[PDB]
């Protein structure tokens with residue numbers, strides 16, 4: 198009775214022919230954990246969609262099966278993207294399994310090799326550019342439009358969004374309905390878009406009656422969807438949402454406007470508080486960007502934007518294991534305590 | 547169609563009273579991945595039981611779900627661990643979800659902080675001691691048996707093994723039979739013991755005609771079971787199997803004896819080869835101990851000990867994301883390249 202490809206599990210809902218060979222690491226089918234302790238504390242009933250348990254440790258895997266399978270079927274020789282993030286690790290894994298070249302474009306200056314390690318493990322070719330992060334985007338786009346054998350797998354890839362919409366399907370599949378509000382973090386806004394595409398596809402299929410309110414959280418230092426303008430120098434420890442200029446700007450706002458949803462900023466402190474909260478109280482280890490979403494849900498419950506007793510799924514987008522640096526910092530100082538059994542046992546209970 | 551807790555999926559084959567409420571993070575039910583390219587080069591059909599997609603990033607969640615449920619039920623207010631490894635993270639998370647204290651005893655001097663971040667992220671109390679790794683094992687054992695509310699969660703805990711056998715169940719549930727050989731890494735030998743318990747349990751219950759030959763790999767520098775005697779100063783990049791003295795030395799040898807199995811050493815180099823190989827060829831980012839399992843499987847297929855065209859399940863025990871440091875080592879640094887899209891396209895092909 199095991200989980201198959203997200204492609205296989207939802208084929209009749211995805212744009213794939215009968216001919217193609219789905220290349221999958223059995224992504225999706227991820228836990229939906231009852232946040233019993235967050236629920237008691239709020240008064241709302243909160244589930245966690247835990248996407249860190251996808252093959253590469255983030256939800257990008259839902260897009261890549263789809264992007265890479267479509268690439269294979271369409272006879273592409275290379276899969277390209279231009280960021281140091283979870284996109285590249287996810288892209289590189291699926292390209293490796295397909296047997297396809299994977300290139301990651303990066304800007305000049307200092308390289309965070311910690312970021313790229315997982316992807317280079319999978320065979321990604323890293324290519325550093327005489328220029329900045331814009332040049333990377335401009336380059337990757339020009340190549341994709343010049344070489345129909347390259348497939349740019351960035352946020353705005355229609356196939357990626359199709360794959361990613363399935364997280365919405367699973368939530369309903371197990372609950373029997375949508376939540377009252379779905380809360381997720383927003384960087385490029387590809388995900389909020391996908392969930393909204395997903396929920397509306399089920400409503401259109403007559404599988405729910407109520408649609409959720411999409412709550413998207415941005416870090417205060419990179420909150421262009423909150424402030425209504427692009428951000429010149431995005432600034433947040435939640436690296437995955439360190440975006441001053443979302444790729445899927447239009448689609449995010451449409452989702453917000455159509456779902457009667459909200460965009461909301463959380464400060465780094467508040468993100469960090471959530472970061473610790475989930476781990477300390479739910480037993481779930483979540484990446485800072487994933488924490489931001491909880492940080493925002495919580496912020497919204499105070500405000501009263503989300504009503505007491507309503508049902509909420511909070512997408513927690515990546516494994517805490519993605520980011521050891523942040524785990525290391527703000528740790529309690531342990532100093533040697535004497536070796537007798539009685540002293541140590543009182544330092545507890 | 548959601549996967550519940552190991553406890554819930556296999557409640558009838560696990561020792562849990564029916565007053566006891568399972569403390570679970572929806573662990574287990576992990577992908578069984580067809581290793582297509584590994585098979586091409588091998589001449590066998592090989593599956594990878596990918597255990598890095600458990601909540602805390604390791605197979606130990608299978609055991610820890612039981613131990614902490616058992617702990618919660620028997621009115622225990624603290625669990626105690628004496629290891630910095632994956633045990634303590636797995637222990638700490640289930641302790642958090644259950645709302646009990648998790649405490650880790652560390653030796654004098656230099657604190658291995660990276661290794662403990664996950665644990666303390668789930669709220670483990672690190673207690674540094676005026677002693678040795680050996681004096682640490684003793685203080686815990688003493689504290690355990692002088693306070694009936696403190697449970698020691700080490701590897702030899704029979705409750706852990708019960709939870710850990712359930713992997714064998716999943717393999718048979720999904721394959722329809724047991725494989726011809728089951729390959730896995732061996733540290734304290736709890737897992738190899740546990741798988742063999744699982745296969746026999748399913749033999750005793752009538753679900754398989756024949757039991758798999760258990761193949762267990764250790765690192766060449768930490769190979770007490772291959773070498774026949776214990777090892778004083780174990781040495782290997784594979785931290786998780788850096789054990790000179792298995793806690794389950796007895797029941798491991800029994801598993802090998804009665805499964806007609808084999809213990810094998812693999813060099814550090816060979817383990818690295820495999821680590822890179824699964825990532826580059828399957829798309830599975832696997833932690834070095836997990837790599838060893840594979841490496842030793844590969845070594846045995848060439849040795850001839852593994853019959854041509856037989857079936858193998860290789861447990862890949864932990865997530866590559868558990869070991870960022872190894873991911874860094876021996877990684878190509880590419881240098882800056884001219885911006886024009888022509889200078890990039892044939893640096894691919």
Ligand SMILES: *Cc1c(COP(=O)(O)O)cnc(C)c1O
Pocket residue numbers: 255256257283284352382383384385386387388389437438484486487514515516
């Ligand atoms: C990519 C990513 C995000 C941001 O998602 P968008 O679709 O760009 O809004 C958030 N969290 C994690 C872990 C990420 O991988």
Ligand SMILES: *Cc1c(COP(=O)(O)O)cnc(C)c1O
Pocket residue numbers: 604605606632633701731732733734735736737738786787833835836863864865
């Ligand atoms: C603990 C562990 C092992 C070794 O398991 P044993 O039962 O001690 O042999 C191997 N790999 C990983 C990832 C582990 O955490």
